Coordinates of C-alpha atoms and ligand atoms in Angstrom, one line a residue:
Chain A
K1 CA -0.2 -0.1 -0.3
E2 CA 1.3 3.4 -1.3
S3 CA 2.8 5.1 2.1
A4 CA 1.2 8.1 3.5
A5 CA 4.5 10.1 3.0
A6 CA 4.4 9.3 -0.7
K7 CA 0.7 9.9 -0.7
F8 CA 1.0 13.5 0.5
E9 CA 3.9 14.0 -2.4
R10 CA 1.9 12.8 -5.1
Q11 CA -1.4 14.8 -4.0
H12 CA 0.3 17.8 -2.9
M13 CA 4.2 18.6 -3.9
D14 CA 5.0 20.5 -7.2
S15 CA 8.3 21.4 -6.3
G16 CA 9.3 21.0 -9.6
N17 CA 7.4 23.0 -11.8
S18 CA 4.9 26.1 -11.9
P19 CA 0.9 26.0 -13.3
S20 CA 2.7 29.6 -15.4
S21 CA 4.7 27.0 -17.5
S22 CA 3.6 26.1 -21.0
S23 CA 6.7 23.9 -21.3
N24 CA 5.7 21.2 -18.8
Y25 CA 2.1 20.3 -20.9
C26 CA 3.7 17.1 -22.3
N27 CA 5.1 15.7 -19.1
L28 CA 1.4 16.7 -17.1
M29 CA -0.3 14.9 -20.1
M30 CA 1.6 11.9 -21.0
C31 CA 1.0 11.1 -17.6
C32 CA -2.3 11.8 -17.4
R33 CA -3.2 9.8 -20.3
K34 CA -1.1 6.8 -19.0
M35 CA 1.1 6.6 -21.5
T36 CA 4.2 6.8 -19.0
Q37 CA 3.3 3.5 -16.8
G38 CA 5.9 0.9 -17.3
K39 CA 8.0 2.5 -19.8
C40 CA 8.0 6.1 -21.4
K41 CA 6.1 6.3 -24.8
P42 CA 9.1 8.2 -26.8
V43 CA 6.7 10.4 -29.2
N44 CA 3.4 10.8 -28.9
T45 CA 1.1 13.8 -30.9
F46 CA -2.2 15.3 -28.8
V47 CA -4.8 16.9 -31.6
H48 CA -6.7 20.1 -30.3
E49 CA -9.1 20.2 -33.5
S50 CA -12.3 19.2 -32.7
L51 CA -13.1 15.1 -32.3
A52 CA -15.7 15.8 -35.3
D53 CA -12.9 17.5 -37.3
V54 CA -10.7 14.4 -36.4
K55 CA -13.0 12.1 -37.8
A56 CA -13.4 13.7 -40.7
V57 CA -9.9 12.8 -41.4
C58 CA -11.2 9.4 -42.1
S59 CA -13.1 10.8 -45.6
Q60 CA -10.3 13.3 -46.9
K61 CA -7.6 12.4 -48.7
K62 CA -5.9 8.4 -48.5
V63 CA -2.6 8.3 -48.0
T64 CA 0.4 5.8 -47.6
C65 CA 0.8 5.0 -43.7
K66 CA 4.0 4.5 -42.6
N67 CA 3.6 1.0 -41.5
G68 CA 2.4 0.2 -45.2
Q69 CA -0.8 -0.7 -44.4
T70 CA -3.6 1.0 -46.6
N71 CA -6.0 2.5 -44.2
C72 CA -4.3 5.9 -43.8
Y73 CA -5.6 9.5 -44.3
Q74 CA -4.3 12.9 -44.2
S75 CA -6.0 16.3 -43.0
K76 CA -7.3 18.8 -45.8
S77 CA -6.1 21.3 -44.0
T78 CA -3.2 21.8 -41.1
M79 CA -4.4 21.1 -37.8
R80 CA -3.3 22.7 -34.2
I81 CA -1.2 19.6 -32.6
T82 CA 1.6 19.1 -29.9
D83 CA 4.4 17.1 -30.2
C84 CA 5.8 15.2 -26.9
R85 CA 9.1 14.1 -27.3
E86 CA 10.8 12.2 -24.8
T87 CA 14.0 14.1 -23.7
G88 CA 17.9 12.4 -23.7
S89 CA 17.4 13.4 -20.2
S90 CA 14.4 11.2 -19.4
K91 CA 14.5 7.9 -17.4
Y92 CA 11.6 5.9 -16.5
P93 CA 10.0 6.3 -14.3
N94 CA 10.6 9.9 -14.5
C95 CA 9.3 10.6 -17.7
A96 CA 10.6 13.7 -19.4
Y97 CA 9.1 15.4 -22.7
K98 CA 9.5 18.5 -24.7
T99 CA 6.4 20.3 -25.9
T100 CA 6.2 21.3 -29.2
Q101 CA 3.1 23.3 -30.4
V102 CA 2.7 22.5 -34.4
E103 CA 0.2 23.7 -36.8
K104 CA 1.3 20.2 -39.6
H105 CA -1.3 18.4 -41.7
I106 CA -2.0 14.9 -39.5
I107 CA -2.2 11.5 -41.0
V108 CA -4.1 8.4 -39.0
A109 CA -5.3 5.2 -39.5
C110 CA -8.8 4.7 -39.6
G111 CA -11.0 1.5 -38.8
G112 CA -14.1 0.0 -37.3
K113 CA -17.5 0.6 -38.9
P114 CA -18.6 3.9 -38.5
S115 CA -14.8 4.5 -39.4
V116 CA -13.1 6.1 -36.9
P117 CA -9.1 6.9 -36.3
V118 CA -7.7 4.1 -34.9
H119 CA -3.7 5.5 -34.8
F120 CA -1.6 8.2 -35.1
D121 CA 0.6 7.6 -37.8
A122 CA 2.4 11.0 -38.6
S123 CA 2.4 14.6 -39.0
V124 CA 3.5 16.3 -42.5
Chain B
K1 CA -11.6 -4.2 -23.7
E2 CA -10.2 -0.4 -24.4
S3 CA -12.0 -0.3 -27.8
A4 CA -9.4 1.3 -30.4
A5 CA -11.5 4.3 -31.0
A6 CA -11.3 5.1 -27.1
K7 CA -7.3 4.3 -27.2
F8 CA -7.1 6.8 -29.7
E9 CA -9.1 9.5 -27.9
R10 CA -7.3 8.8 -24.9
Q11 CA -3.9 9.0 -26.3
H12 CA -4.2 11.7 -29.1
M13 CA -7.2 13.8 -28.2
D14 CA -7.0 17.1 -26.2
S15 CA -9.9 19.5 -27.9
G16 CA -9.3 22.9 -26.9
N17 CA -8.2 26.1 -27.5
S18 CA -5.4 26.9 -25.0
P19 CA -4.2 23.2 -24.1
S20 CA -0.7 24.5 -22.5
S21 CA -2.6 27.7 -20.4
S22 CA -1.8 28.1 -16.6
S23 CA -5.8 27.7 -16.5
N24 CA -5.3 24.3 -17.4
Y25 CA -2.9 23.7 -14.9
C26 CA -4.8 22.1 -12.1
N27 CA -6.7 19.6 -15.0
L28 CA -3.7 18.1 -16.2
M29 CA -2.0 17.7 -12.7
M30 CA -5.1 16.0 -10.8
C31 CA -5.8 14.0 -13.7
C32 CA -1.7 13.2 -13.4
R33 CA -1.4 12.8 -9.8
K34 CA -4.6 9.9 -10.0
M35 CA -7.8 12.3 -8.1
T36 CA -9.6 12.1 -10.7
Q37 CA -10.0 8.3 -10.5
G38 CA -13.6 7.1 -9.7
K39 CA -14.7 11.0 -8.7
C40 CA -13.6 14.1 -9.2
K41 CA -11.6 15.1 -5.7
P42 CA -13.1 18.5 -5.1
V43 CA -11.0 20.6 -3.5
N44 CA -6.8 19.7 -3.7
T45 CA -3.8 22.1 -3.1
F46 CA -0.5 21.6 -4.9
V47 CA 2.4 23.2 -2.9
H48 CA 5.5 24.5 -4.9
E49 CA 8.4 24.7 -2.7
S50 CA 11.0 22.4 -1.4
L51 CA 9.9 19.3 0.1
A52 CA 12.8 19.7 2.6
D53 CA 10.8 23.4 3.0
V54 CA 7.9 21.4 3.6
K55 CA 9.2 18.5 5.6
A56 CA 10.2 21.6 7.9
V57 CA 6.8 22.5 8.6
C58 CA 6.5 19.5 11.0
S59 CA 9.0 21.3 13.4
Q60 CA 7.4 24.4 13.1
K61 CA 4.0 25.9 15.2
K62 CA 1.8 23.1 16.2
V63 CA -2.0 23.7 15.1
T64 CA -5.2 21.3 15.6
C65 CA -6.2 19.9 12.9
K66 CA -9.6 20.9 11.6
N67 CA -10.6 17.4 12.4
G68 CA -9.2 17.5 15.9
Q69 CA -6.6 15.5 15.3
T70 CA -3.9 16.8 17.4
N71 CA -0.7 16.4 15.0
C72 CA -0.8 19.7 12.1
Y73 CA 1.9 22.2 12.0
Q74 CA 1.4 25.5 10.6
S75 CA 4.1 26.6 8.6
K76 CA 6.4 29.4 9.9
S77 CA 6.2 31.8 6.4
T78 CA 4.1 31.5 2.9
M79 CA 4.5 29.1 0.6
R80 CA 4.0 29.2 -3.3
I81 CA 0.7 27.0 -3.9
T82 CA -1.8 26.3 -6.3
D83 CA -5.4 25.7 -5.2
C84 CA -7.5 23.6 -7.6
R85 CA -11.3 23.9 -7.1
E86 CA -14.4 21.9 -9.3
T87 CA -16.0 24.0 -11.4
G88 CA -20.0 24.5 -11.6
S89 CA -19.4 22.3 -15.3
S90 CA -17.5 19.2 -13.7
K91 CA -19.1 16.0 -13.6
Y92 CA -17.3 12.8 -13.2
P93 CA -15.6 11.6 -15.7
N94 CA -14.9 14.7 -17.3
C95 CA -13.3 16.8 -14.0
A96 CA -12.8 19.9 -14.5
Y97 CA -10.7 22.5 -12.1
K98 CA -10.5 26.0 -11.6
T99 CA -6.7 26.6 -10.9
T100 CA -5.6 29.5 -8.6
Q101 CA -2.1 30.8 -7.7
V102 CA -2.0 32.1 -4.0
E103 CA 0.9 32.4 -0.9
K104 CA -0.2 31.6 2.0
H105 CA 0.6 29.5 5.3
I106 CA 0.2 25.8 4.6
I107 CA -1.1 23.5 7.7
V108 CA -0.2 19.9 7.4
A109 CA -0.4 16.4 9.9
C110 CA 2.5 15.0 10.7
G111 CA 3.1 11.3 11.0
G112 CA 5.6 8.5 10.8
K113 CA 9.0 8.4 11.8
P114 CA 10.7 10.5 10.3
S115 CA 7.9 12.7 11.1
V116 CA 7.1 13.9 7.6
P117 CA 3.9 15.4 6.4
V118 CA 0.8 13.2 5.8
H119 CA -2.2 15.2 5.0
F120 CA -2.8 18.4 3.6
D121 CA -5.0 20.3 6.1
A122 CA -5.6 24.1 5.0
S123 CA -4.0 26.8 3.8
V124 CA -4.1 30.3 6.0
Ligands
LIG1 O1 3.7 12.3 -35.0 C1 3.7 11.0 -34.6 C2 4.7 9.7 -34.4 C3 4.3 9.0 -33.8 N1 3.2 8.7 -33.2 C4 3.1 7.8 -31.8 O2 4.4 6.8 -32.2 C5 4.3 5.8 -32.2 C6 5.4 4.9 -33.4 O3 5.1 5.5 -34.6 C7 2.5 5.2 -31.8 O4 2.2 4.9 -31.0 P1 2.0 3.0 -30.8 O5 2.4 2.1 -32.3 O6 2.5 2.5 -29.3 O7 -0.1 3.2 -31.1 C8 2.0 6.3 -32.1 O8 1.4 6.8 -33.6 C9 2.8 9.8 -32.5 O9 2.2 10.1 -31.7 N2 2.7 11.0 -33.0
LIG2 O1 -6.9 24.1 1.0 C1 -7.0 22.8 1.0 C2 -8.4 21.7 1.8 C3 -8.4 20.7 1.4 N1 -7.6 20.2 0.9 C4 -7.9 18.8 0.5 O2 -9.3 18.4 0.9 C5 -9.3 17.1 1.5 C6 -10.5 17.0 2.5 O3 -10.2 17.9 3.2 C7 -8.2 16.3 1.6 O4 -7.6 15.0 1.0 P1 -7.8 14.1 1.7 O5 -9.2 13.6 2.4 O6 -7.5 13.0 0.3 O7 -6.2 14.1 2.5 C8 -7.2 17.5 1.1 O8 -6.0 17.8 2.0 C9 -6.6 20.7 0.0 O9 -6.2 19.9 -0.4 N2 -6.5 22.0 0.4

């Protein structure tokens, strides 16, 4: 069972950082969205457009998937996204990321019925 | 089993205009620090001072805890803290918080050996 001391540090300590940072986004979001458990996911992109806009990409430009599958689609317009990339300093479990705000076209794999995004392939 | 569609939303969607804004700190932190599992913790404070300074409080001014326990201590000096409070809008599993930065004395309960902070009681 997590110690009371450890619980206090988890719930109440942020030594660490300040809320006024813009660059801590990936650190917190990768943790929030459970991509730092077991190991640090090295690269992950968050999309800030609406879910409807991202789902719409599945009806947009058919493109080659980086993994050679044939179910990828490129957005017709650039989207506001954030790339989270694990730093060289980063060491599990202290997963550290650089946050890069970008506006690029996204490529996603679509699947299911209705066809919706199931994998983020790349940005271009 | 987490659906592929849901996994994509978790890994890659963060819809909004100012994702990295300071106003989003509590949303991100409350999630990352596991205070939005099951229910939204209604009120929570993060402390931006060194862990040594917070541990030091355990040898500072004795005060009675809000709950009548007798192991609380008030910081001799003010500390940089952030309050996270649920908004009217907020409802599980969509926990929403208002982020507020203040400088206040903290009151914590101390326990264990060494005696360290185990509960965040109040700020004054
Ligand atoms: O720009 C990119 C490129 C890649 N990935 C991400 O990196 C992993 C390997 O490609 C993929 O994770 P995964 O194969 O565990 O779902 C994911 O799409 C991104 O999130 N953004
Ligand atoms: O200023 C405050 C006041 C309260 N709490 C918080 O509210 C809960 C019950 O009061 C406590 O969480 P807990 O019951 O998991 O210890 C916590 O200290 C704060 O984090 N800051």
